[PDB]
Design a protein around this ligand. Sequence first.
Ligand SMILES: [K+]
Ligand SMILES: [K+]
Length: 488
Amino acid sequence: SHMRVAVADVGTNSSHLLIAEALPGDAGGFRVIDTLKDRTRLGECLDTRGELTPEGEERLASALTRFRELAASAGAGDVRVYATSALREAPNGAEVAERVRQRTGLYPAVISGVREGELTYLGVREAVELGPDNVLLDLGGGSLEFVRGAEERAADVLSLPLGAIRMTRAFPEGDGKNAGRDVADAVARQVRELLRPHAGRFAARPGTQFFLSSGTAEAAADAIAQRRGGRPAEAAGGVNGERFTLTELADLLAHVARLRPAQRARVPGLERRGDTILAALSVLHAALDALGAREVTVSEGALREGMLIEELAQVQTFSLAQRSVLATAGRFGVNLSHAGQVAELSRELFDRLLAAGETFPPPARSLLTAAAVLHEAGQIVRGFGPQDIELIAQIARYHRKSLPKPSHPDYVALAPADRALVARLAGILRVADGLDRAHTGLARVDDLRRQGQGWQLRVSGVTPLDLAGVGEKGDLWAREFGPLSVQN
Ligand SMILES: [K+]
Ligand SMILES: [K+]
């Protein structure tokens, strides 16, 4: 009943963790239990080639070790990890992520900037009052997402390389009096060059509400509130829902550009961003000005909140879409997200095989779903008859070197057609667990076609770990249905 969930995002400035407990009623809601930030500073750990250094890998692994520990102390156990610009753009990111999974057990799965904007927008929705027409800016250390949408989800997402660290490094500050103003001006021109062909999609219309998320914008809201004679936001309840104007942002930026980098970390509210804050504030001002914004609201919800919403959405709606089967897997303490995603992928692969001509018996789909949800219940290695559950049991636990050997007592041998059914469904299920090996819930089958005497599988939303898992978990598919080639 007390089922707790953990999600994390690995970005360019820092890494973030949210541990929460879901709300009853298959509603899609959660109660926050714990949050954690880690100054992983991956964007400062890139080499001249853009590769993440062994020191960045260590900081990564360290953060995911902290995350895995806190998540288990709270009772979550498994953590879904998404990664944004630093690891996404690093030529060695796939390697880094596989290495870091070996060390910690957590795989940092790179998502597209569009999907980063999409999920961030759901996090903002969980924190503030979106209206019929919203434009969100999310400035990280590496990129800046522009998102527009209405009251429930994103409509258009653009992702630009205008991040706080990236812009600080791309316009190094000089030694003169106007050095800060000159960095601000040049950063502001870079924003204009890259946004200009897309500005209209995010431009102010009558009634448009503008929102900012993430730590630069939160620091700026705090600095502006303190410049209006306010108290530090940490002494208060945070900055969620605070509003400031474009003029106030402009005023703070002018002050910052006049200061020297070390002086900026003594500006109240900016003490933890002195090195990137000048460039960061230029990005924010220039972009908002390009879009015609005059006021913004700041949100403390971001990627990790939308990660929990998207997860709870699919997981709870799948149980509505066997509903006890996901619940019974809960009694065995399994990762319901993984189990539900593996069941959906099994469903997807099964239907294409049927449509291509493969004959299956009527209960086969129901059997594969049930074994899909109980594949990782250590204890196990409802409208199902006693013979069906035995079939389900053997599908969940299929291996060539079975723990009981045929000659050994207690060995359970089915009838030949059931043996053959188990093998064919276990090959489907294994491909499915491969497609969610990264535990992202993001894989989807797009097309599965016969290719000669074998098959060709097209998958989307798949990480390099997921694709590797199918290759390592698809040998049974090849014996049962024919050689399998996966693409995209
Ligand atoms: K971001
Ligand atoms: K310009």
